[PDB]
Amino acid sequence: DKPTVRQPDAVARSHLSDFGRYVAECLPKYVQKVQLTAGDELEVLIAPEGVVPVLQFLKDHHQAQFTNLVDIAGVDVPCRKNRFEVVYNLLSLRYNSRIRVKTYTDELTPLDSACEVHKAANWYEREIWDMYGVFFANHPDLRRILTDYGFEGHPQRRDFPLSGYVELRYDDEKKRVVCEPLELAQEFRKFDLSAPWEQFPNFRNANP
Amino acid sequence: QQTLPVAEVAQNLPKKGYSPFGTKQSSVAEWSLARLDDLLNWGRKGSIWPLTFGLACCAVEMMHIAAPRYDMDRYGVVFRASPRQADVIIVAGTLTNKMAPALRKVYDQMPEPRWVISMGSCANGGGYYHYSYSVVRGCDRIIPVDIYVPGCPPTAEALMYGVLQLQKKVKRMKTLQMWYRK
Amino acid sequence: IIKASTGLTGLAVSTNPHHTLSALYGKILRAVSKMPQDASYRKYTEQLVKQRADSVAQHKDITALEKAVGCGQVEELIVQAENELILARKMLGWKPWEKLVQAAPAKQWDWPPAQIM
Amino acid sequence: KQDLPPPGGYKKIPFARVPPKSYFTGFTTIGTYVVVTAVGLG
Amino acid sequence: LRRDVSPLIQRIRAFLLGREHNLALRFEDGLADRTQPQPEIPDGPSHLLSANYYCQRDGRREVLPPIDLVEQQKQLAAKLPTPGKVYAWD
Amino acid sequence: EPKDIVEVPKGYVYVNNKELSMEFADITDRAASTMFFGELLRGFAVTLAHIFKEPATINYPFEKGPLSPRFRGEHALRRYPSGEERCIACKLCEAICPAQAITIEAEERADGSRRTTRYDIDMTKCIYCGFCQEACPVDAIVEGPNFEFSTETHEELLYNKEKLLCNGDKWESEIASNLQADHLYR
Amino acid sequence: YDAYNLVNFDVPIGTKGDCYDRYLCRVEEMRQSLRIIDQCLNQMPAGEIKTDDAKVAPPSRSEMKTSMEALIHHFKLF
Amino acid sequence: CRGDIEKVTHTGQVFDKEDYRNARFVNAKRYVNENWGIKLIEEVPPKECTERVVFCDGGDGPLGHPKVYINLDKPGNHICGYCGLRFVKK
Amino acid sequence: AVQQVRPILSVDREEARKRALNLYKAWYRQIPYIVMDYDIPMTVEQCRDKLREEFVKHRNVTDIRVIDMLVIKGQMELKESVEIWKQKGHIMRYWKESQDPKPTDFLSKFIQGV
Ligand code: SF4
Numbered sequence A: 001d002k003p004t005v006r007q008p009d010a011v012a013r014s015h016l017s018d019f020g021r022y023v024a025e026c027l028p029k030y031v032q033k034v035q036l037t038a039g040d041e042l043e044v045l046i047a048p049e050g051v052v053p054v055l056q057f058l059k060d061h062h063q064a065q066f067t068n069l070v071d072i073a074g075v076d077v078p079c080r081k082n083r084f085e086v087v088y089n090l091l092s093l094r095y096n097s098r099i100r101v102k103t104y105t106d107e108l109t110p111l112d113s114a115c116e117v118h119k120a121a122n123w124y125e126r127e128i129w130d131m132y133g134v135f136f137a138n139h140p141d142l143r144r145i146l147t148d149y150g151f152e153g154h155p156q157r158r159d160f161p162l163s164g165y166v167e168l169r170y171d172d173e174k175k176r177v178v179c180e181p182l183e184l185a186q187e188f189r190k191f192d193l194s195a196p197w198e199q200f201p202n203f204r205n206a207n208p
Numbered sequence B: 001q002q003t004l005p006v007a008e009v010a011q012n013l014p015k016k017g018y019s020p021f022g023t024k025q026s027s028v029a030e031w032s033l034a035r036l037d038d039l040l041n042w043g044r045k046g047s048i049w050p051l052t053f054g055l056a057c058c059a060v061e062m063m064h065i066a067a068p069r070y071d072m073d074r075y076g077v078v079f080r081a082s083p084r085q086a087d088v089i090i091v092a093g094t095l096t097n098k099m100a101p102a103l104r105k106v107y108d109q110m111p112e113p114r115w116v117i118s119m120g121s122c123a124n125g126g127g128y129y130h131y132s133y134s135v136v137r138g139c140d141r142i143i144p145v146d147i148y149v150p151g152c153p154p155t156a157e158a159l160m161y162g163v164l165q166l167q168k169k170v171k172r173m174k175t176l177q178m179w180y181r182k
Numbered sequence C: 001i002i003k004a005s006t007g008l009t010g011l012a013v014s015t016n017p018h019h020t021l022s023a024l025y026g027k028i029l030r031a032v033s034k035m036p037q038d039a040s041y042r043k044y045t046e047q048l049v050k051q052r053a054d055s056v057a058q059h060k061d062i063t064a065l066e067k068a069v070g071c072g073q074v075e076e077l078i079v080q081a082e083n084e085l086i087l088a089r090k091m092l093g094w095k096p097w098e099k100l101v102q103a104a105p106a107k108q109w110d111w112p113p114a115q116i117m
Numbered sequence D: 001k002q003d004l005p006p007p008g009g010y011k012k013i014p015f016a017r018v019p020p021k022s023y024f025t026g027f028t029t030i031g032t033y034v035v036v037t038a039v040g041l042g
Numbered sequence E: 001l002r003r004d005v006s007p008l009i010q011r012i013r014a015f016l017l018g019r020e021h022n023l024a025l026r027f028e029d030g031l032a033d034r035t036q037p038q039p040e041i042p043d044g045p046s047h048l049l050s051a052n053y054y055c056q057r058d059g060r061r062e063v064l065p066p067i068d069l070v071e072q073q074k075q076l077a078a079k080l081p082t083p084g085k086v087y088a089w090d
Numbered sequence F: 001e002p003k004d005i006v007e008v009p010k011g012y013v014y015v016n017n018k019e020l021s022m023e024f025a026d027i028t029d030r031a032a033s034t035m036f037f038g039e040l041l042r043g044f045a046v047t048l049a050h051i052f053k054e055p056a057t058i059n060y061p062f063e064k065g066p067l068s069p070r071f072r073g074e075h076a077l078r079r080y081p082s083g084e085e086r087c088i089a090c091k092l093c094e095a096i097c098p099a100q101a102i103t104i105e106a107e108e109r110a111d112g113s114r115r116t117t118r119y120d121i122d123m124t125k126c127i128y129c130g131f132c133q134e135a136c137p138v139d140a141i142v143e144g145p146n147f148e149f150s151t152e153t154h155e156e157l158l159y160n161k162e163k164l165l166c167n168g169d170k171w172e173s174e175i176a177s178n179l180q181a182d183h184l185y186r
Numbered sequence G: 001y002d003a004y005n006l007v008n009f010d011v012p013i014g015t016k017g018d019c020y021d022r023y024l025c026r027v028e029e030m031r032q033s034l035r036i037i038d039q040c041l042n043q044m045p046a047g048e049i050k051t052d053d054a055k056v057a058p059p060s061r062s063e064m065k066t067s068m069e070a071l072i073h074h075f076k077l078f
Numbered sequence H: 001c002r003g004d005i006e007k008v009t010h011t012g013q014v015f016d017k018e019d020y021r022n023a024r025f026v027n028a029k030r031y032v033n034e035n036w037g038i039k040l041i042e043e044v045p046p047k048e049c050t051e052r053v054v055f056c057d058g059g060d061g062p063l064g065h066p067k068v069y070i071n072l073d074k075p076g077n078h079i080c081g082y083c084g085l086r087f088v089k090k
Numbered sequence I: 001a002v003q004q005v006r007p008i009l010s011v012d013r014e015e016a017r018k019r020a021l022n023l024y025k026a027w028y029r030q031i032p033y034i035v036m037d038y039d040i041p042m043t044v045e046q047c048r049d050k051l052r053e054e055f056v057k058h059r060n061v062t063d064i065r066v067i068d069m070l071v072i073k074g075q076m077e078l079k080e081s082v083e084i085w086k087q088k089g090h091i092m093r094y095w096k097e098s099q100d101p102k103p104t105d106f107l108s109k110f111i112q113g114v
């Protein structure tokens, strides 16, 4: 027996596999790929034109009441052609389950706002807009929610620096908090924590 | 440093007294101004009113000197919400880029004398978000700070030690003696 | 014998839940009758709405109906039926039983991004 | 030795809500108020 | 003994509280000892000298890439489905 | 005993589920509590009973509150009992420091030792997390018992190697007692 | 998650949805957490604190200062 | 005059008189440790051993440095790289 | 070299230029309220000159989605300027205050080390 290895839940595997084949059968227009990851989590990989009609479907069907939307997450992967991906995590209280709906979006290409489906997307879709520049069309008001009012740029992209571009200091000549180009007293020491030997042989050919 | 005096040495030492200046002033006007400054500093250190400026987690320890175990009220210290009625501002938390003009305006509307306590590593030196895009690298770039309390969430004995160090600074304030020597 | 309260804030106890459920299931069937028969959503929706209409036709009592269906209270059944009717009237506009409008681009859905070849 | 419960276990930690003792009654309070003000008027 | 008032003030406080009062502050005899003997931490399942190989208990290397559920049916085929059990939150 | 509006299940407890009583005794009881401030009288009595309680004020600084042997305070650099400094400049503490406060610069000494030429901890950047003493292979860097080290000036919290060595010289007894009473837990 | 299925407790549910029901739910959560604390002090097994995969958890300081693989894993994981 | 400014440290560092950075010590004391490690490790005598290989722990077991083994076949004093204690074989 | 994308806030460059002119018109109407409601040293004519300078800085762009992105961010800054959420320090960030003008000649950059 192996007590240091997490045992997967089979009743969260079979139900999620049957539901993944079910949602692939019910929506062949938008759903490209459904996958059951390690850790018993189901991912649906939709087209960017199907953000609203998939998240509406999982909201209102009898066999899928994913009525709760917990978080909308943006991941910036600059290697890909469409660099941003947007992940909608949905919780189903009736069937006691979770789903993740992932789509790909570029900064210039807009995305459908899920605010008509779930009202939590009134704010979460602002936050990605504050941090990646993913424009969400047909939004109630798409404003800047977390960064400063005079901030220029989206900070959580991987092409943005860690320490930012500018700093703030009080100027007693102008009697106000002015903006200066960045000069750190001690620079950020970039540690080269790269593994020269591969440790996972199961992920060697997982890219095709 | 200096070695703290051994009790054989310290028994020969005389008592320090309350006044840091001493009662050995030459002129009667200089002595009268020294005792008036001592009374003024006693009145100022006898009640400092800090301002309810709690930005982040450090402030959860700030309420823990309000708490019955540590009890800031028997040190002259009681919270005031308005910045006009307050002596001290305790920067307890993380000053960000959107937080900078608010802190500067709140400090500027406070009336002088103005002592500032930086509570926690985000308040002085930037701390754990020092290399962040939207965190000011310490509040010393904006607000002039008299006491810097070191711990990431300062224990409440250490924040009250900063309060007693501020009281020792207020007791060491020389205003009328400087006026006599100006 | 009607219940005093449903236990949820903002939900009122339905006076006639059986007629409302039967009318909503009939409206869902009349909505999905316009869809092509090769679509899977129409077949699955017709199957579930037919079995729930059989459930609301066999049981004339409220508590026996909530025990037989097993998905919450009967007010939640009315809420789910209205939600499915909204979904079906959106499916007649969106038409999702066709092919993919945008295939996945190359190196898009593989996670480890910077691996060569 | 490790940090373990004692043999026989701990005692039952109280978690329920006990009310304070209420001596008064509403009829008694109204009647005593009426009697007290009737003596006070005289 | 404990730092406490005389029993007249005790009964006044217990009458005004409406319940039998227990002390809200810790004491030295009502707390654990600050100085204490050294402990020993017991060994776990893999501290045995024999028959322990890492590859039999390797947690990180048993993780696979996620299974394509559309292709899994296609390569394995060569009561409506629900995402979980029904929970009645009413 | 009022009736339940909603039937309470086995695994749940319901608050504000009692029906409002309609018999005349309960209406007169609620009426007298409204008119004569009975529940306010109970609140006043419960408030007044806490005047007679013991105050929990611990009278700082003559009496100081409880601490623990695991307590994280001023970072300090220890020494061997022979007198050589413990820090072998192995730089796991700076690699594990999440705020990156520690700066280490190391050269070979005259006898061939590895010991540092620069060990700086920015205590305005240090978050007092104790990762350095866990990542220290020897017991060189340590969290001292001291927390009364508030400074008047911002630069005085930039701790040098000599300040850390002076902290290790000053606080050696309590640090050694805590490490003797705490090493078998770690 | 993390032995919450081995403890037994009740869940506070409100009805009106106002601030009073949420306040009563929070104080009832404080009441039920006392009996979860009581069950956790009543049953506590005697065993290890960390997982024994030394490549995901740091080893003991005696093993780090005595054995070689634990020193290598302490060096790498720190 | 102040003798705490021109005093060298154990790293061989001193601010010379033409430096601008000695203006920071006109109101504050320059902290120089008077307990140098070099003299305090030269003060202890070497340990004489008869066996060919020895082990150095540096003190107590869990409270010392990690255990090393030093080979004393070469004549002279062999210095432990962790603690600095010197061993010698007769 | 040609791809089909989803338009953001425009379908042609004349429409995008028209909406940029709407943005400039609303900014020009909001200048004297910005000078009145903020405690800034800059006057109305200096604010209008700065508005013209920031528009001719972005004169060079050509792409429809890029110019619509610029119009969207300009309308967001304008909405942060009508409702007073920006401060006096945020308004005076367009003028590069408390910044020494860096020289352009090679000799002064060679002496200063830049
Ligand atoms: S200094 Fe530490 S405790 Fe204080 S606000 Fe920052 S992270 Fe929180």
Ligand code: SF4
Pocket (backbone or CB within 6 Å): F086, F087, F088, F089, F090, F091, F092, F093, F094, F104, F132, F135, F136, F137, F138, F140, F141
């Ligand atoms: S981990 Fe310890 S011995 Fe290693 S460099 Fe840091 S303080 Fe020195």
Ligand code: SF4
Pocket (backbone or CB within 6 Å): F075, F093, F096, F097, F098, F099, F100, F101, F102, F121, F125, F126, F127, F128, F129, F130, F131, F132, F133
């Ligand atoms: S306690 Fe944490 S923040 Fe402070 S020096 Fe050690 S590792 Fe760095």
Ligand SMILES: [Zn+2]
Pocket (backbone or CB within 6 Å): H056, H057, H058, H065, H080, H081, H082, H083, H084, H085
């Ligand atoms: Zn050694």
